[PDB]
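ERR on first pass: missing label on line 2. Operator R.T. fixed the label and resubmitted. Corrected input:
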Amino acid sequence: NQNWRLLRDESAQLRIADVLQRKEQFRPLAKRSFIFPASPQAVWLQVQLPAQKVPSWLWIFAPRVQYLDYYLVQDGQLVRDQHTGESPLPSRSYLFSLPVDGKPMTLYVRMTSNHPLMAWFDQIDEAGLVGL
Amino acid sequence: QNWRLLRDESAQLRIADVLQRKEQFRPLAKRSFIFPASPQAVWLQVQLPAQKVPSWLWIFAPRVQYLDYYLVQDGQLVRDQHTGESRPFQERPLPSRSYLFSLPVDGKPMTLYVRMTSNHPLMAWFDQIDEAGLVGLE
Amino acid sequence: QNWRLLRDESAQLRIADVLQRKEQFRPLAKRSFIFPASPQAVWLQVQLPAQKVPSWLWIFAPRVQYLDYYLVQDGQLVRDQHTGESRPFQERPLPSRSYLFSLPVDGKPMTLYVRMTSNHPLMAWFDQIDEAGLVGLE
Amino acid sequence: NQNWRLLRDESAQLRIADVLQRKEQFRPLAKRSFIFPASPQAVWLQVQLPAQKVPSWLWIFAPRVQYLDYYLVQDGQLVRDQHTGESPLPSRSYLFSLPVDGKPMTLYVRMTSNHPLMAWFDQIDEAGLVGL
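pass 2 clean. output:
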């Protein structure tokens, strides 16, 4: 029972455009984290969310991720894109604020790394974990 | 000027109107105002030259129910936000009630301690961040 | 490590104690935690090297009633704050619910508009500020 | 009926130590602003406040002030001191956060300028003007 699905792209060639054509390949998550042996795969997280009532963030904790790409889709078009990751930066968290605009949204996160790829992620709002 | 003000007692003017009334705005003596409870709408107009460095318009508007912001360039609406106390607060790169603690630049190591307690479930997210992560990226 | 944790189920340990129990703290896998509602006290311990640039410990602790922070150096208490939701929020250089609007650095002039409305008395303070005024000075 | 008093030091030689010995020379304010012809006087504002219950700031708006000196006294000793003023800075406001520590405090502000010295000042908290 979760809005959190995952796609492993062992080839690392999928771009956001490609991944939008591939939604039935995202598989469900039993839990909001993952861990994989160090490799050149791209891992894609897809988060399907309803329209938001209150300020929220996507929180991801992903140590040693070298490239983290974040995309926000509505509705079938790309509204925000940010490109970050460890690439003199002492943080390993990422927050992305989520718009309150009466619309559903999809988030996509691409992660790549030369180390074991792991991450934990949650939706949080000002009272904490969305869902209480 | 160049921080200016216009009172709309009708509460019914919109951005389109207020760009055709550019000159009805009266210069402020100081960068604040207070008016007794009324259904009026107050409009603020700020004219700025080109900018060399990051900067923000900061507005502290306690009890303002509807706040609407618009950035204009060449007579064009470039950005707009809508917030106020009767609406969701603006997006922020971090939750506005997060706690922040300045770490000293002083050539010495440091250890930090934080005790937390609650009668609701105990939950915290935390990290060390720099200027950029505090501000967001533009 | 080096972001570490210790659970005090008694809720009764104090800073003096927790410096004599340095090694009971267990390394975190990730920089957050959640525990079901209990009267325990959770202590966080963060070991940092000397610092070259401004930086902050950021803690987002929604529903935490009592939060206590201490900065230690050479085994000495250098700073301490006490806040949490059941206490006054920490001092901030600006009110934490102020609204901030990024002004673009783009070689062009700009005008800004803000509509405000309330059913309580109408009051706003505002200005254009830079990185330093946003952060305070150390 | 106000906690806001003023001292003109036409000589500009008073230091914070001197001004603490001179409290009966601060005269009351009819309103929370002032304006003087451009001159080399120092103007000192003294704000007497009770222990605070909630987060508050001292707000001062003082365009073209060249030196603004802020001091917070408790109880007879100087706890905070900041030295600012227009001296590439596009603001003309100053906020100073006020500690909530169950103690009264006195604020002192010294202002100097080569232009007409004016200022408006208020105590504000998260609901607005302290006093509503």
